[PDB]
Design a binder for this molecule. Structure first.
Ligand code: HEM
Ligand code: HEM
Lengths: 145, 145
């Protein structure tokens, strides 16, 4: 359940999320686009969900992809900002889940973002310990799907 | 169309938006809920689009309303962050409008948020000068609806 999953965000997981987000969230456009391109590269099967975006291979030059990527980074910002209060984090995660549920994105499909996060982190000198902290946060969202 | 409306965001307008946001955006949950409850109070007919939120009369105590209210504030954060780059502003505004168009929210209906914005700014002592600035940002969104 979402409440049980939120409980897995221990003190050090919260800290590692904050420390890494201080860097990653610094360049929402570049890292947001990097994330999406990585997902599309590593999991081509997911492109079908993004038909509205047009030619995703254009990367930064695709205005729709750019607008989506930037926006995705503000949902992450939201989640980091709610870490202090589990009640607030859970209501924001359930709110975020509505549209994803409507699109038929299952927990397993959503979990495909972990690879792309790990790669983006690694590109900023954040290793496994950080990739695992983020996988925990992503697991809160999966619990809601 | 959106580019033209973005052209009204002059340097003075942008400055007033950033200064007021510095205060309003510092309590996303408090101000986001005050926005929503003011909208419902002043334009009861807008509740029609929020059946999913349930008992909106509970205000902050309603988890779904709280969830939606905090999230709303990240859309404004996004917009404020893109003020210096019209190309990014426009792509984030068009991305934002997609679900609103789907919900059949017209520019006229979207404009009902202006009163609530003006009352929230005034509660923090931001006068007409500031409400006009905000009305110009809402107009960019209206141009995309
Ligand atoms: C870190 C994980 C993710 C975050 C933070 C995220 C965030 C967002 C946000 C903020 C929106 C815009 C509001 C909305 O319409 O719900 C959105 C839209 C969307 N999301 Fe997610 N997303 C993530 C992962 C995914 C994954 C893995 C998929 C599919 C496999 C997906 C599918 C979609 C689609 C198809 C849209 C609409 C795109 C458009 O047409 O503009 N998302 N996402
Ligand atoms: C400054 C103005 C506004 C901002 C920044 C804002 C922002 C947002 C955001 C970020 C979402 C979540 C993502 C999505 O589903 O699109 C959302 C959802 C929604 N918005 Fe807007 N919104 C604004 C005004 C309005 C107005 C005036 C209406 C209708 C009169 C409206 C109707 C909706 C509805 C019905 C939802 C989905 C609610 C739910 O079931 O969770 N929005 N809005």
């Amino acid at each position: 359940s979402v409440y049980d999953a939120a409980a897995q965000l221990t003190a050090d997981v919260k800290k590692d999320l904050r420390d890494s987000w201080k860097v990653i969230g610094s360049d929402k456009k570049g890292n947001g686009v990097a994330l999406m391109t990585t997902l599309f590269a590593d999991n081509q099967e997911t492109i079908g969900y993004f038909k509205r975006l047009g030619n995703v291979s254009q990367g930064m030059a695709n205005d729709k992809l750019r607008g989506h990527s930037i926006t995705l980074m503000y949902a992450l910002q939201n989640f980091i900002d709610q870490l202090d209060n589990p009640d607030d984090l859970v209501c924001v995660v359930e709110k975020f889940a509505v549209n994803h549920i409507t699109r038929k994105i299952s927990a397993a499909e959503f979990g495909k973002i972990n690879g792309p996060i790990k790669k983006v982190l690694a590109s900023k000198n954040f290793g496994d310990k950080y990739a695992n902290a983020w996988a925990k946060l992503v697991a809160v969202v999966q619990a809601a799907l």
